[PDB]
């Protein structure tokens, strides 16, 4: 019974939709269903953090947060810079198929894990770096996660980055509530020393059923959660929830900032909602608020 023209955040100029009718229908499904059937799957880097800071200030990735620590050997930032310079162009190569990218991404993550080995490391360094960027989350992220917790909605942060940094940022932002789980590449510690990352490897091209599916540990938390909101700033992010078999309705929300017109067609074909230069969580928040309205009514 909800109409799109009565939902202000969806009517704004930056909100692009290939098919507003299907979006409206999905929203109505969400609200009929209630919070108890809702689940969230969100990318971290430049989805939860800002692509454009209100200030001119730059925001580093999770890996960027790690690599900026002092406890690192003096060779580390050099070697990681070399690796990045090598594999980053490949990661964002439009012409290259994903089935060709995967090998090279495997190379990147492998070499990186092997780089981060043999020296001890303290979480508090990470924390010290991460505390400077709690102010760089999208506007109303705190309120968004507050909503999620209050509604008891399982929220997954699915990241191909460095989980320690992610968790540090989220914790220090006072946003990592009991309902929030993080699946990412986490540091592995052996006998007081680093030993790469803990299996399984999560790269940019397996943020999907190959990693998150019915066999996964997290599935038991959300096997009753058939209404999914997926949030991301990259095309790949759109398939993060492909491994949930009995999902009936999925709202795919994509945040477009870089190369707006070039990527607009792809993003519109990929996401149900495309948000252009939107550094807030006001749209997902809107959805949740409708769902909660219906919840109180019942
Ligand atoms: N060892 C690695 C592996 C990946 N990356 C970059 O971080 C992004 C995930 O947050 C990936 O998309 C990738 O660009 C990195 O900086 N260092
Ligand atoms: Cl990622
Ligand atoms: Mg991202």
Swiss-Prot record:
What is this protein identified as? 7-methylguanosine phosphate-specific 5'-nucleotidase
Q: Which domain of life is it from?
A: Eukaryota
Its annotated function is as follows: Specifically hydrolyzes 7-methylguanosine monophosphate (m(7)GMP) to 7-methylguanosine and inorganic phosphate. Also able to mediate hydrolysis of diphosphate (m(7)GDP) to 7-methylguanosine and 2 inorganic phosphate with lower activity. The specific activity for m(7)GMP may protect cells against undesired salvage of m(7)GMP and its incorporation into nucleic acids. Also has weak activity for CMP. UMP and purine nucleotides are poor substrates.
State where substrate binds: 159-160
Q: Which cofactor does it need?
A: Mg(2+)
The family this protein is said to belong to = Belongs to the pyrimidine 5'-nucleotidase family.
User: Binding positions for Mg(2+)?
Assistant: 43, 45, 233
Which UniProt keywords are present, listed alphabetically? Hydrolase, Magnesium, Metal-binding, Nucleotide metabolism, Nucleotide-binding
The GO terms this record gives for MF are: 5'-nucleotidase activity; magnesium ion binding; nucleotidase activity; nucleotide binding
Q: Does the keyword field hold Ribosomal protein?
A: no
List the source organism. Drosophila melanogaster (Fruit fly)
Relate the outcome reported for changing residue 63 to H.
Increases KM 3-fold for m(7)GMP and increases KM 10-fold for CMP. Decreases KM 6-fold for m(7)GMP and increases KM 2-fold for CMP
What residues bind N(7)-methyl-GMP, as annotated?
91, 112
Gene encoding it? Answer: cN-IIIB
- Which enzyme class? hydrolase
Q: Name one GO biological process term.
A: ribonucleoside monophosphate catabolic process
What are the leading ranks of the lineage?
Eukaryota, Metazoa, Ecdysozoa, Arthropoda, Hexapoda
The active-site annotation reads 43, 45
EC number in record: 3.1.3.91, 3.1.3.5
Positions of CMP binding:
91
Q: Name one GO cellular component term.
A: cytoplasm
């Amino acid at each position: 019974r909800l109409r799109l023209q009565d939902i202000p955040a969806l009517t704004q100029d930056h909100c692009r939709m290939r098919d507003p009718a299907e979006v409206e229908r999905i929203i109505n499904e969400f609200v009929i269903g209630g919070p108890e059937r809702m689940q969230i799957v969100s990318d971290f880097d430049y989805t939860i953090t800002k692509q454009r800071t209100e200030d001119g200030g730059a925001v580093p990735s999770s890996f960027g947060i790690f690599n900026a620590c002092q406890s690192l050997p003096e060779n580390f930032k050099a070697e990681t810079d070399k690796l990045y310079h090598k594999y980053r162009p490949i990661e964002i190569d439009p012409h290259m198929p994903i089935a060709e990218k995967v090998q090279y991404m495997i190379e990147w993550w492998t070499k990186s894990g092997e780089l981060t080995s043999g020296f001890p490391f303290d979480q508090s360094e990470i924390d010290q770096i991460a505390s400077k960027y709690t102010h760089a989350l999208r506007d109303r992220t705190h309120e968004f996660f507050a909503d999620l917790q209050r509604l008891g909605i399982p929220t997954l942060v699915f990241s191909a980055g460095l989980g320690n940094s992610v968790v540090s940022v989220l914790r220090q932002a006072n946003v990592l509530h009991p309902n929030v789980k993080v699946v990412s590449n986490f540091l592995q510690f052996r006998d007081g020393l680093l030993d790469g990352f803990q299996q399984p490897m999560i790269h940019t091209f397996n943020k999907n059923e190959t990693v998150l599916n019915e066999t996964s540990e997290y599935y038991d938390l959300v096997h009753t959660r058939d209404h999914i909101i997926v949030m991301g700033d990259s095309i790949g992010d759109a398939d993060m929830a492909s491994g949930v078999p009995a999902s009936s309705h999925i709202m795919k929300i994509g945040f477009l900032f870089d190369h707006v017109e070039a990527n607009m067609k792809k993003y519109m074909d990929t996401f149900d909602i495309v948000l252009v230069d939107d550094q807030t969580m006001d749209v997902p928040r809107t959805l949740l608020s409708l769902i909660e309205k219906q919840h109180k009514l019942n």
